[PDB]
Ligand binder design. Structure first.
Ligand code: BMH
Ligand code: ZN
Length: 224
């Protein structure tokens, strides 16, 4: 289908969003409500994800995290705000979105002319540091610049699942916004945290991998 939502471990689900360039995002089904990690490409793809969420749980969608300021992680924001969900990001992501949204939309449309000219929709919950949701079961952190200056990781300690949004994936992908020399330093900072990881979900290409996706991508970026 256009979008799928599949259980990875317990309350942790992976979204495969096949619109435009395939992007993978996360959903966490909590006791009081649902957290979406990555807003998906557009308001219409966000509505498609909501439809799948509502076949799994009746609990409200409480918040959606923009793991960077780009279209594939924040494009759905209009829809999520419209249904009362908070849109959550770091201060750095929010500030880059304000100044650079028009630029990323135009860049996205160069490769994907069919992609809509979406108006700016900013996060309404903004964090100055690392942060958690779902009583500490969803943990968002910054470990330096990589694919964009602002990209964050989201870790799910109970399930030992790491999501890196656009940072981790199978193919080199698009480096036009990246800090190529810092990229492996950020991945090494991440590895030095020694997080128990069983599963890494890539933000593009096939989602399900083990911890070695980090090493895979590190080696690719060091050759770029
Ligand atoms: C700058 C781009 O990077 C960004 C965009 O232009 O919106 C968005 N995120 C990527 C990325 O590398 O994470 C790309 S996805 C990347 C590019 N190619 C094309 N098809 C698959 N791959 C993965 C996507 C359009
Ligand atoms: Zn991306």
């Amino acid at each position: 289908a256009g979008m799928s939502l599949t259980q990875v471990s317990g309350p942790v689900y992976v979204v495969e969003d096949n619109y435009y360039v395939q992007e993978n995002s996360m959903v966490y089904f909590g006791a009081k409500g649902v957290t979406v990690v990555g807003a998906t490409w557009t308001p219409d793809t966000a509505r498609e994800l909501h439809k799948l969420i509502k076949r799994v749980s009746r609990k409200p969608v409480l918040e959606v995290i923009n793991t960077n300021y780009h279209t594939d992680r924040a494009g759905g924001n209009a829809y999520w705000k419209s249904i009362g969900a908070k849109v959550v990001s770091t201060r750095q992501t929010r500030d880059l979105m304000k100044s650079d949204w028009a630029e990323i939309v135009a860049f996205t449309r160069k490769g994907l002319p069919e992609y809509p000219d979406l108006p700016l929709v900013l996060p309404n919950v903004v964090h100055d540091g690392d942060f958690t949701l779902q009583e500490g079961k969803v943990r968002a952190f910054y470990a330096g610049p990589a694919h964009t200056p602002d990209g964050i990781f989201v870790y799910f300690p109970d399930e030992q699942v790491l999501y890196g949004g656009c940072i981790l994936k199978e193919k080199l992908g698009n480096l036009s916004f990246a800090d190529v020399k810092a990229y492996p330093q950020t991945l090494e900072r991440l590895k030095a945290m020694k997080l128990p990881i069983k599963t890494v979900i890539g933000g593009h290409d096939s989602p399900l991998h083990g911890p070695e996706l980090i090493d895979h991508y590190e080696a690719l970026i060091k050759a770029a």
